[PDB]
Amino acid sequence: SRSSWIKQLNASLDEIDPEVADIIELEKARQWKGFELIPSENFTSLSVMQAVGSVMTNKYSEGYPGARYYGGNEYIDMAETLCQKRALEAFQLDPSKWGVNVQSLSGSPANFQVYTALLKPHERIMALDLPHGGHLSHGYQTDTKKISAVSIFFETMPYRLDENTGYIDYDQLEKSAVLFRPKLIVAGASAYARLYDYARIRKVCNKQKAVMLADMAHISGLVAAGVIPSPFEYADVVTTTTHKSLRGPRGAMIFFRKGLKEINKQGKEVMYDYEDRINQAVFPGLQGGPHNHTITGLAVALKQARTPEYKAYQDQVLRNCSKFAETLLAKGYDLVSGGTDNHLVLVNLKNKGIDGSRVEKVLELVHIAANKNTVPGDVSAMVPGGIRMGTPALTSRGFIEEDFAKVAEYFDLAVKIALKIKAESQGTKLKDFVATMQSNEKLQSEMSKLREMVEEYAKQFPTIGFEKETMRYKE
Amino acid sequence: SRSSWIKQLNASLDEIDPEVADIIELEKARQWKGFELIPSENFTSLSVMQAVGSVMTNKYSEGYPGARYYGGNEYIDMAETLCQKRALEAFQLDPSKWGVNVQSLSGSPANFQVYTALLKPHERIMALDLPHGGHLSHGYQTDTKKISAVSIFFETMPYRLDENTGYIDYDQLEKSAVLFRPKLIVAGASAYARLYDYARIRKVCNKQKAVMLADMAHISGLVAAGVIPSPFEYADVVTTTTHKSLRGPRGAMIFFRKGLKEINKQGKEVMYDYEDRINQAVFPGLQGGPHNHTITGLAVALKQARTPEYKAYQDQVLRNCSKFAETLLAKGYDLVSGGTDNHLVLVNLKNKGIDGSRVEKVLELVHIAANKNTVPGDVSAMVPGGIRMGTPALTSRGFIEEDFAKVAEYFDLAVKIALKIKAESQGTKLKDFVATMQSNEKLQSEMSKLREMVEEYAKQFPTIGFEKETMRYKE
Amino acid sequence: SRSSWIKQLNASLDEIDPEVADIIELEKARQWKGFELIPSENFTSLSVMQAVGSVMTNKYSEGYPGARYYGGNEYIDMAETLCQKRALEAFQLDPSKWGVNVQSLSGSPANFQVYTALLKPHERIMALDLPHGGHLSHGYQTDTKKISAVSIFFETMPYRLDENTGYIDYDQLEKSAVLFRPKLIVAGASAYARLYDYARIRKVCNKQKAVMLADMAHISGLVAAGVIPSPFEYADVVTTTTHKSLRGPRGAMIFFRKGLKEINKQGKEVMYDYEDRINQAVFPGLQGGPHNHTITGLAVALKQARTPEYKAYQDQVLRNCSKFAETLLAKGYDLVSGGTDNHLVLVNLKNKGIDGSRVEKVLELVHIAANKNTVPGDVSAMVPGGIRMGTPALTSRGFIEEDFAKVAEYFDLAVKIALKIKAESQGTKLKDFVATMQSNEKLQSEMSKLREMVEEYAKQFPTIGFEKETMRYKE
Amino acid sequence: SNAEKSRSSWIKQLNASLDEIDPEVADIIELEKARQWKGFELIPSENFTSLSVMQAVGSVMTNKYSEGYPGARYYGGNEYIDMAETLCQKRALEAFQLDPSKWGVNVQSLSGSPANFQVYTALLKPHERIMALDLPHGGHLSHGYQTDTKKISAVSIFFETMPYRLDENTGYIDYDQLEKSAVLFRPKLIVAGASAYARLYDYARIRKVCNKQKAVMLADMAHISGLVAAGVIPSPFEYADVVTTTTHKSLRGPRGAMIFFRKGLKEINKQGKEVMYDYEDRINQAVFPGLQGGPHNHTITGLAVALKQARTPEYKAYQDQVLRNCSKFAETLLAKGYDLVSGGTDNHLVLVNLKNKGIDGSRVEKVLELVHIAANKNTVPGDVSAMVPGGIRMGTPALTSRGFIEEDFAKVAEYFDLAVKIALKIKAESQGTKLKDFVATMQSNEKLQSEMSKLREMVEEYAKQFPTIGFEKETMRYKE
Ligand SMILES: CN(Cc1cnc2nc(N)nc(N)c2n1)c1ccc(C(=O)N[C@@H](CCC(=O)O)C(=O)O)cc1
Ligand SMILES: CN(Cc1cnc2nc(N)nc(N)c2n1)c1ccc(C(=O)N[C@@H](CCC(=O)O)C(=O)O)cc1
Ligand SMILES: Cc1ncc(COP(=O)(O)O)c(CN[C@@H](CO)C(=O)O)c1O
Ligand SMILES: Cc1ncc(COP(=O)(O)O)c(CN[C@@H](CO)C(=O)O)c1O
Ligand SMILES: Cc1ncc(COP(=O)(O)O)c(CN[C@@H](CO)C(=O)O)c1O
């Protein structure tokens, strides 16, 4: 059994677990044949995946480079030090003014670790309201329930959009902050199509003596390439995931000011007080052993973020989204804020007489991956009135402006099918919509035809991270 | 532009990032050449790593199978459902009595998610004291500082070993619980060498109406193979990491009772109330998108845990540690609790007149990877008096009992060198010990000789997860 | 020896403690010869004082009538039950819809006991901002310090005046409450000259599902007499002191809704859930033995509150304050909100070119007792711009409208002296003002003349609660 | 006409006597006066206040608002209120022989329970840890208390409490277990104070534990403060950081409280820096503006009177008699076959463990009440439930104030014993085993009712002979 279990440890996935191998092959074909429009998704490189799938996973390395609680970490230290160096370089940060923690396991715990580092329990946080494009890891509660645990352990209050313009209502943010006295204000969003006024957030944070946390998860790759303004110009702390526009592994980073404070902010302490608190909140506070396979893959992704090819990619992401929005507007769709400055759009389906749940069900059946999304003016969060879509993932496969014009066309055809399913539905209920969607033979034929059109279009483009020639599912 | 960055996305790690490729090859050689004795470390299979390094990383799948927020999750749902099914099967659990969450990113957040699910902020937790072999994610504070964030957000109090026997003092645990009124008691440890009396903990939890949480991270593979008694016989909730004795990817699982608990005095069924609370604490409470590459690799590892070869491995892990302990004792070392019933030992160096920091520095230089560790009787956590070592990792490479007798010999030779360095150190500070260790030619030669002995012994064994023939650093 | 301490226990205050007896005689003369304008002060009756100074103080009576810890409480129960029933009658409350607790020791703990009964620690409270006329027992924090412990144990946020009108800005209160989600809103003030819009507060509390607490301490006697609108029409809970306009002993009452609240969606009766929680928060939650002497004096005060002459008194309080306000306005003073609808006025002195601290120092020296008071627009609570004055105390002595016209004249003469002291001061500091006020023979003579005028006017009126003829200090 | 008629009417209302204005309340007070005349008042927390204190508490000092502290007020008109509070503080320090450079005092706290809560609020953050004597072992609710069911005291809601307990073999506090518990629990504050404990505290031992844990030592001396002031037992001020007390109970003052706290140098630390005590500002600010508003100046003035009395030789003689009476009481109970918790007493009370008499405290307390002997049932070591107590608590302060001496408390023990004999007869005649069957017999058995009537007459006849405290017998409305 000794030599036998060594064979099982060194055999390939195809031989050891054909069921799992088949699932991955099906997912490869899904990524090949679909319109992947979820703006938080991307296709990471083969080189990142080879690092994440390496023996770096075997090592325990609690602590920080050169200051570990375990032996054997000479090369894990090289990886984490290299990752930190490349993280600062990717955002053109002076290492005497900025530090970074690369151990946070994902975006949601990264933010919680910042709160734990800098705030006592029940201290006050302001952030963009979830139904107005915020994120759960900034806090969220309903009339009856705290949904995010951020709102359990800390005291949260939202700020909102101007529902007439679709931009953040900074005037109301400032006035609210005077009364609520936040200790930390979050500048970051999941479904905001415009650029943040980081200068205004900084002004409010200075008046309130609040920490300015920029959560740039969605835009980090755009920031790294220098194609939009950087939150590092203003923020005290910057969190980000590594798997969205950055195009890296699933993970996160926390950046923070260090060294001497501004002349007019030096007092009983002259140095920033973020580095030790954040590093200690990550470990020993809330995490144990770093995931060194992810950290090593992150180092790879951060080197890729420096290249001219990467800047060209992020430029194309923005130009594709601009064209995408223009085509949607010309086909009659309403966009929240009327357009976009970044990688995503938010379609408000109110002017079409159908909701996001119904449209997304059709999108899924025609191999278009998006998400239903609350829009300003929605009466209920349970019934989202919009669809969120973006350009990072298909841009990575080589979609350019005319290709996203085609994506908008096929989105439009899917909405028209959803409207027919609604018209053919007997009752008002979503259950009746689904029953029509699964029983009507003519409308199933139209969805089947649209699905073939999407797949034929998407299949022409390169696959990212694997070769077409060795795919199990080539049809 | 297009074809340029698409080639970057599909190129190998060797092509794209030679510096990172070099670091991984160095780490491969280190895992080949050394005694990897950290008891929380293992060598996972190639098939696990191929799944972790797959395109499953690209998908956002917030929610649970068949109840996602995004579209496109048909195959991610297969993987997570398969992982859940295999998790219950690996521990012989009745799915009508047990459920499982496989999304928790690692062991430390998994425990925090259980606390957040079942306890209000500042409610009370008892667990094994960190200096007596507990874990930071069960709580820990000094008289001046909360070290673990568990002790910030919840109210923790330790239970302790009988310092005469090295076993948990269950009588004092019970008496303390009467006074402290815990809402949850943790049964699990990082450096405890004996089996838990889960039945006794169950009786205390019943008396206190406290949740019984077994944290089986270290022993989960032993439990899965059935070679030690199972905490599932008694516990309400069981947490575990997946990368230690289980031999899987870096990740975690939370198991919990579900279904009928009891009939009340009025004949009405009373159901367990763990499942919804725990699942909602993981998401949307504390995490965002699941790491589907890790969940997929975990499904692979859980299938591997079912084989007769895996059971033979875990039986060898136990026999190896017994022989290891026996040989250390014969060579004059003291072990906490005087021996072992599991996969690890904790050496208390007090009778040798040297601390764990000094010994671990020599171990590191002779390529024995272990950790300095606090022991009962240490006056300061800054000066650990022990060394923790265990058998899972080298047993995975085929070490058997006589091989761990040799590991004990080489550990002893390293301690003898550390004692010589201490004797030659003119000063008493650790930096004086380091200065002697780095400048004394005779003792550098002794360490070089022992390092060569360790490497010659370790290199003869198979490498796990890669082949020797293609190693870049064979010399 | 036994005879020795019996004599000590039964001797008069004059025999036992001449120093304390003399202090009381000096205070009697001060209450006789001065203008007592502090609007939270009154002169309570001889009969109340005889009950408060009775042997009812000797009994320990933890618990509630008929449910005491100890025996011997048959007559204490007569008094407390009588007090409770008289309390409901004093405010014309239906005892099937309202209950009352009469044990709370004073106004500040009464509010804290309500919060403890109905809110978990760190739950949210809104109340009128302290510098805008609120009270510390509703919460208060500065930029750097929690001043009220209500703001330590609960999460507080103020609502504010419209600084253009001096009335509460109910529109902003409602908007703030949407974002802050208070669990309790306080409707009550210490330095607000207008009537509360209780119906508007009720509307906001209904929308927010918040408890409506009316703190009527200042206006309780006006409410009992039925000469201003009652908060009991709208509030869930009503707190009050017993020593202000109610004219009773120093103490407090907590009223709460009980019985049927409404019918739910299933047609089921929903009952109020305040009574048990509040009674248990008072005892055993936060207090021990009731002060039976105060409760007995309170019963006496509540019987007085039901009489026609008590209503005539409170009607006179209102007419006196209206005349007072009219006379101040005619003499060029600015009043916050432009006037009054209750028992007090708040004079904003800024248009006269002097502050409240300086004016109050002169008032004190001419035997006019008022308080310096923050006004809306003050930047520092350390430099108050206003003076607060009211009519309950002097109305009790028989001052009528023409007499308060005279009070306004003498106030104005004191302001003129303060302005002369400021003009003569050799410096701008309060310390320089005081030095001039104490050394300038001419201004000292003017203050002596005004003091004689105040005392000659006040001495004409009856003494309340003691006989003028037997006073020690009749000169 | 009517306006002036009304004004004259409400002024007449304010100046009329209680007898004229509210005869119903006056009658209640007269009934309570007669009750205090006729009973054996053995509840050890009760006492009889002096006339001079009551005259100050019932004075026009009640009319004044004086938020803040002497010389630092937020209202005008406080020249004489300042004299009273300053005098009260001075006499408070003098009553316990305290150096004002080492001790400060706050005299504004409204009663014993909020006084402790104010100390916790001053010195502890929310949810920080407190240890105190368990309530059924002799503690007090204001130190925290929770059952398996729920948190009873709000101290246990806002702070994290854990009890320490008696050695149930000896009846003394188990100081060894307290120390071991503190190592694990890490209290920030330990309370040394009891309400139903017949022994004095080992303040030296508490001090050692507090020093080792870097915890505040709070002595809550409510039950013993008058003994401390008279110098007849050791003082908590020798050891404690902060001392709270009721001003009623042992001290025999008005209903109120005091908070004492160390001032000045705590230690010179390892770096050579003076560490000063940080209690005065935190406690004073917790009382106001933190948790209270206007001081109750009538109570503060009555307290100054009580504190002057506490320094006299008559008061010292009284507190000496309190202790000697309790010892004689204990002597007589032991001679009559009763067991005392801890085997005796060192203070003003005893805890009778009724186990060897075959009857519990609930039954005995009911008979005592019917014969006008005021005592209270009390948990004793060995009880299975805190709800069915096996003992009775009795003490000497109140009757000693009326002039009971040693031979009189021998008689009190005799009449207590006669009541126990009646309770045992009721239990023997009870058709059933539950407490309601006992009450059914107690209310129905004509012969046993007659014995209780006889014993009640004996109790009242004995008590009536002694002086009344705080009022004259001659002017009582109820002279029978
Ligand atoms: C003690 N206290 C409460 C307070 C203030 N004025 C009163 N005035 C009266 N007549 N009565 C009171 N009971 C009263 N209480 C205070 C203390 C300081 C500040 C204060 O200075 N606040 C400033 C600055 C303090 C800071 O920022 O640190 C602010 O931020 O608005 C206010 C109120
Ligand atoms: C408020 N309080 C003190 C209390 C209650 N009632 C009294 N009743 C009287 N007549 N006298 C008292 N001194 C008295 N004291 C309480 C409240 C609940 C429990 C209680 O429930 N104890 C549990 C046992 C303790 C536990 O569960 O930890 C029980 O079995 O009833 C005890 C005391
Ligand atoms: C601004 C921001 N901060 C944090 C996170 C969380 O990252 P995680 O999913 O890795 O936890 C997200 C993820 N956002 C996902 C939903 O979770 C999205 O599709 O937009 C985010 O948008
Ligand atoms: C019982 C238990 N529960 C949880 C964890 C945390 O797992 P994580 O490191 O993946 O967070 C550990 C890790 N234990 C590591 C140190 O963190 C070890 O070397 O032993 C653990 O031992
Ligand atoms: C609305 C309200 N609620 C509560 C209180 C507190 O009463 P207390 O001083 O008896 O604690 C007050 C007292 N107000 C006093 C200052 O404390 C005053 O001069 O106005 C109050 O105005």
DSSP secondary structure, A214-231, as one string: EE-TTTHHHHHTTSS--G
What single string gives the DSSP state of each residue in B250-273? S-EEEEEE-SEEEE-TTS-EEE--
For residues C349 and C411, the answer to whether their CB atoms sit within 8 Å is no
**B135 interaction partners in chain A (CB closer than 8 Å):** 288
Q: Tell me how far apart the alpha carbons of residues C436 and C433 are, in angstroms, rounded to a whole number.
A: 5
Structure tokens at A182: 């936040």
Count other Cβ atoms within 10 Å, centred on residue B435.
Answer: 15
Query: Residue B155 to residues A121, B121, B201, D471: CA-CA distances in angstroms?
Result: 13, 8, 19, 54
| Residue B241 is among the residues annotated as catalytic for this protein | yes
> What letter would DSSP give residue B191?
S
Residue among B59, B118, B6, B15 at smallest CA distance from B289: B59
Q: Tell me how far apart the alpha carbons of residues A116 and A109 are, in angstroms, rounded to a whole number.
A: 10
Ligand number with the minimum distance to the CA of B60: 3
What is the torsion angle, in degrees rounded to the nearest 10, for the CA atoms of residue A63, residue A64, residue A68 and residue A72?
Answer: 120
Structure tokens at D149: 């069911």
| The amino acid at A152 | I
> D420-443: b or e for each residue (b if 16 or more CB lie within 10 Å)?
bebbbbbbeebeeeeeeebeebbe
Solved with = X-ray
Ligand 4, atom 14: closest residue by C-alpha: B190
For residues B154 and B121, the answer to whether their CB atoms sit within 8 Å is yes
Q: Which helix (H) or strand (E) holds A344?
A: strand A344-348
| The amino acid at D117 | F
What single string gives the DSSP state of each residue in C21-41? HHHHHHHHHHHHHSEE--TT-
> What letter would DSSP give residue B64?
E
Q: Tell me how far apart the alpha carbons of residues B193 and B389 are, in angstroms, rounded to a whole number.
A: 10
Residues 6+ apart with CB under 8 A from C23: D80, D83, D84, D87, D301
Atom of ligand 2 nearest to the CA of C70: 10
Residues 6+ apart with CB under 8 A from B447: B362, B365, B366, B417, B437
Backbone conformation region of residue D266, classed left if phi is above 0, alpha if psi is from -120 to 50, else beta: alpha
Atom of ligand 3 nearest to the CA of A134: 1
Q: Tell me how far apart the alpha carbons of residues C360 and C370 are, in angstroms, rounded to a whole number.
A: 7
Nearest chain D residue (CA) to C245: D63
Q: Tell me how far apart the alpha carbons of residues D390 and D363 are, in angstroms, rounded to a whole number.
A: 10
| Residue D255 is among the residues annotated as catalytic for this protein | yes
Query: Residue C366 to residues A434, C118, C449, C453, D435: CA-CA distances in angstroms?
Result: 85, 47, 8, 9, 69
Please answer yes or no on whether A176 and C181 come within 8 Å at the CB atom.
no
| Residue D74 is among the residues annotated as catalytic for this protein | no
Residue recorded with tokens 């502290």: D69
For residues B349 and B389, the answer to whether their CB atoms sit within 8 Å is no
Reduced to 3 states (helix: H, G, I; strand: E, B; else coil), residue B389 is strand
Atom of ligand 1 nearest to the CA of C374: 8
Count other Cβ atoms within 10 Å, centred on residue C246.
Answer: 32
Determine the length of chain B: 475
Residue among B176, B108, B102 at smallest CA distance from B138: B108
Structure tokens at A296: 């090593």
Q: Tell me how far apart the alpha carbons of residues C269 and A63 are, in angstroms, rounded to a whole number.
A: 59
Query: Residue D336 to residues B135, D330, D350, D352: CA-CA distances in angstroms?
Result: 59, 10, 14, 12
> What letter would DSSP give residue A126?
E
Nearest chain D residue (CA) to B140: D184
Q: Tell me how far apart the alpha carbons of residues A58 and A293 are, in angstroms, rounded to a whole number.
A: 8
Query: Residue C93 to residues C86, C200, C223, C343, D236: CA-CA distances in angstroms?
Result: 10, 22, 12, 23, 49
What is the torsion angle, in degrees rounded to the nearest 10, for the CA atoms of residue C26, residue C28, residue C32 and residue C38?
Answer: 100
> What letter would DSSP give residue B161?
B
Residue among C200, C217, C197 at smallest CA distance from C208: C200
Residues 6+ apart with CB under 8 A from B50: A12, A13, A53
> A399-437: b or e for each residue (b if 16 or more CB lie within 10 Å)?
bebebbbebbebbebbbebbbbbbeebeeeeeeebeebb
Q: Which long-range contacts (CB under 8 A, 24 or more apart) does D182-186 make?
A: D182/D131, D182/D209, D182/D212, D182/D213, D182/D215, D183/D213, D184/B157, D184/B158, D184/B159, D184/B160, D184/B176, D184/B180, D185/B157, D185/B179, D185/B180, D185/D129, D185/D131, D186/B141, D186/B143, D186/B157, D186/D129, D186/D213
Show which subunits contact B, needing at least 3 CB pairs below 8 angstroms. A, D
Whether the CB of B40 sits within 6 Å of ligand 4:
yes
> What letter would DSSP give residue B219?
G
Q: Is the dihedral of CA A67, A73, A78, A83 positive or negative?
A: negative
For residues B385 and B348, the answer to whether their CB atoms sit within 8 Å is yes
Residues 6+ apart with CB under 8 A from C220: C240, C241, C242, C244, C245, C246
**A179 interaction partners in chain C (CB closer than 8 Å):** 157-158, 176, 180
* Beta-sheet strand order (sheet of C98-101): C98-101, C252-257, C237-241, C211-215, C184-187, C124-128, C155-159
Angle between helices D435-444 and D406-429 (to 10 degrees): 100
Q: Tell me how far apart the alpha carbons of residues A254 and A88 are, in angstroms, rounded to a whole number.
A: 11
| The amino acid at B192 | Y
Structure tokens at D125: 């953050």
Structure tokens at D390: 């096996």
Count other Cβ atoms within 10 Å, centred on residue B380.
Answer: 10
Residue among B109, B63, B19, B290 at smallest CA distance from A243: B290
For residues C203 and C346, the answer to whether their CB atoms sit within 8 Å is no
Structure tokens at A336: 């929240």
Q: Which helix (H) or strand (E) holds A158?
A: strand A155-159
Whether the CB of C240 sits within 6 Å of ligand 5:
no
Burial of B331 (0-12, 13-18, 19+ CB in 10 A): middle
For residues D114 and D291, the answer to whether their CB atoms sit within 8 Å is yes
Pairing mode of beta strands A386-390, A344-348:
antiparallel
Instruction: Tell me the β-bridge partners of A346.
Output: A388
| The amino acid at C418 | A
For residues C420 and C444, the answer to whether their CB atoms sit within 8 Å is no
Q: Tell me how far apart the alpha carbons of residues C229 and D9 are, in angstroms, rounded to a whole number.
A: 25
Q: Tell me how far apart the alpha carbons of residues A140 and A145 are, in angstroms, rounded to a whole number.
A: 9
| The amino acid at C47 | S
Angle between helices C198-208 and C170-180 (to 10 degrees): 20
Residue among B147, B227, B244 at smallest CA distance from B189: B244
Cα-only R_g, chain D: 24
Reduced to 3 states (helix: H, G, I; strand: E, B; else coil), residue B71 is coil
Structure tokens at C6: 């019996």
**D317 interaction partners in chain C (CB closer than 8 Å):** 1, 4-5
Strands (E), A364-441: 368-369, 371-373, 386-390
Q: Tell me how far apart the alpha carbons of residues D162 and D182 are, in angstroms, rounded to a whole number.
A: 9
Structure tokens at D173: 């506090």
For residues A385 and A348, the answer to whether their CB atoms sit within 8 Å is yes
Chain centre distance of CA C472: 30
> For residue D454, how far is its CA from the centre of ligand 5 (angstroms)?
53
> For residue C244, how far is its CA from the centre of ligand 5 (angstroms)?
9
Residue to substitute from D5, D27, D28, interface C, most C β-carbons within 10 A: D28
- Which phi and psi (to 5°) does residue D189 adopt? -155, 135
Instruction: Tell me the β-bridge partners of D471.
Output: none
Residue among C229, C189, C181 at smallest CA distance from C205: C181
Pairing mode of beta strands D391-395, D349-353:
antiparallel
> B57-80: b or e for each residue (b if 16 or more CB lie within 10 Å)?
bbbbbbbbbeebbbbbbebbbbbb
Residue recorded with tokens 């990072």: A392
For residues A147 and A140, the answer to whether their CB atoms sit within 8 Å is yes
SS3 track for chain D: CHHHHHHHHHHHHHHCCHHHHCHHHHHHHHHHHHHHHHCEECCCCCCCCCHHHHHHHCCHHHHCCCCEECCEECCCCCHHHHHHHHHHHHHHHHHCCCCCCCEEEECCCCCHHHHHHHHHHHHCCCCCEEEEECHHHCCCHHHCCECCCCECCCHHHHCEEEEECECCCCCCECHHHHHHHHHHHCCCEEEECCCCCCCCCCHHHHHHHHHHHCCEEEEECCCCHHHHHHCCCCCHHHCCCEEEEECCHHHCCCCCEEEEEECCEEEECCCCCEEECCCHHHHHHHHHHHHCCCCCHHHHHHHHHHHHHCCCHHHHHHHHHHHHHHHHHHHHHHHCCCEEHHHCCCCCEEEEEHHHHCCCHHHHHHHHHHCCEECEEECCCCCCCCCCCCEEEEECHHHHHCCCCHHHHHHHHHHHHHHHHHHHHHHHHCCCCCHHHHHHHHHHCHHHHHHHHHHHHHHHHHHHCCCCCCCCHHHCCCCC
Structure tokens at C357: 């601290």
Q: Tell me how far apart the alpha carbons of residues B130 and B190 are, in angstroms, rounded to a whole number.
A: 9
Q: Tell me how far apart the alpha carbons of residues A118 and A115 are, in angstroms, rounded to a whole number.
A: 5
Q: Tell me how far apart the alpha carbons of residues C197 and C170 are, in angstroms, rounded to a whole number.
A: 8
Q: Which helix (H) or strand (E) holds C213?
A: strand C211-215
Residue among C417, C425, C423, C413 at smallest CA distance from C443: C417
| Residue C64 is among the residues annotated as catalytic for this protein | no
Residues 6+ apart with CB under 8 A from B183: B118, B119, B123, B124, B125, B210, B211
| The amino acid at A90 | A
Q: In A213-367, where does DSSP find H-type helix?
A: 220-224, 275-280, 292-304, 308-330, 356-365
Q: Which helix (H) or strand (E) holds C237?
A: strand C237-241
| The amino acid at C326 | E
Determine the length of chain D: 480
Pick the catalytic residue from D49, D246, D301, D400: D246
Reduced to 3 states (helix: H, G, I; strand: E, B; else coil), residue A244 is coil
Q: Tell me how far apart the alpha carbons of residues D305 and D53 are, in angstroms, rounded to a whole number.
A: 6
Q: In B91-181, where does DSSP find H-type helix?
A: 107-118, 150-153, 170-180
For residues B274 and B256, the answer to whether their CB atoms sit within 8 Å is yes
Is there a cis peptide before residue C39, judged by omega within 30 degrees of 0? no
Q: In C107-237, where does DSSP find H-type helix?
A: 107-118, 150-153, 170-180, 198-208, 220-225
Residue recorded with tokens 């009054």: C340
Resolution in A: 1.6
Query: Residue C286 to residues B195, C73, C110, C121, C151: CA-CA distances in angstroms?
Result: 47, 21, 10, 14, 18
Residue among A111, A66, A60 at smallest CA distance from A84: A66
